[PDB]
Design a protein around this ligand. Sequence first.
Ligand SMILES: Nc1ncnc2c1ncn2[C@@H]1O[C@@H](CN(CCCNc2ncnc3c2ncn3[C@H]2O[C@@H](CO)[C@@H](O)[C@H]2O)CC[C@H](N)C(=O)O)[C@@H](O)[C@H]1O
Length: 273
Amino acid sequence: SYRHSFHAGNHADVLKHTVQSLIIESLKEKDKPFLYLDTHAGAGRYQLGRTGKYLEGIARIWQQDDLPAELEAYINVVKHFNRSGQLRYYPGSPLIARQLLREQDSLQLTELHPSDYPLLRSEFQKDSRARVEKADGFQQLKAKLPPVSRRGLILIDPPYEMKTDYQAVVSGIAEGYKRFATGTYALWYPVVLRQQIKRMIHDLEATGIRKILQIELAVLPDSDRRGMTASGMIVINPPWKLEQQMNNVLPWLHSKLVPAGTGHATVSWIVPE
Ligand SMILES: Nc1ncnc2c1ncn2[C@@H]1O[C@@H](CN(CCCNc2ncnc3c2ncn3[C@H]2O[C@@H](CO)[C@@H](O)[C@H]2O)CC[C@H](N)C(=O)O)[C@@H](O)[C@H]1O
């Protein structure tokens, strides 16, 4: 039976999966196959619920009739999994990739958690494009790159339960980048303590890697006491349209996700070309 999740479809999920969908839609503009690599893939999909963070996330987005055209692909995948019109299922990143990728493209998904891996495996049991491995995700940035197709989106989306996640993401990014330097790397991060993020970003600059874009949506100002008040996406080699797309949808997302106007929503270069 599909996993229940209290956090699935929260504002962080809306931003991450928005960005994942747009990157994927950009890579589909060329006929040649690409790889979708998901270092930390989770269960695949989530049974929702009135409680659950989704009420303040995807529920405030998916039935809006002023949807910016940039969200259509993402929201269309959510609708696919809730055809009766009642918000009951949220697709994880592997399923957004499963629905958006074409016949020719490939998926490589790892999940270590023994409760989620078997669910994740059955989601691709009949999909000859996809492989699912019970492996450490960070190790995949060495073992699976470059893809044979030499095109790809790599999503690095660890739990950040262990504070070492903030260093592993960066060294893993540098490991994969040396091997596949034209790939698009998307790193999801949460803002719990802002000092954590300043250090991680400083470590990313220290690698010298170029073309690093930062997309961050905050539902409250930085705090010392309130858990995750913001999340972001850091994109190495973003498709050329991504920055203008995010400038278009980010204020909209913030408007609908945070009526009170707390927090912020920003697109900026950590490191330009
Ligand atoms: N706290 C959570 N617990 C369980 N599920 C959660 C939680 N937060 C979000 N999710 C949902 O699974 C998420 C990710 N997914 C698998 C679940 C990974 N396991 C987690 N373990 C402990 N803490 C987690 C976890 N995930 C986020 N946190 C965070 O807790 C934050 C506040 O929220 C921060 O402090 C941070 O520590 C990856 C699948 C794939 N890459 C995809 O994109 O789906 C995410 O997508 C969301 O849907």
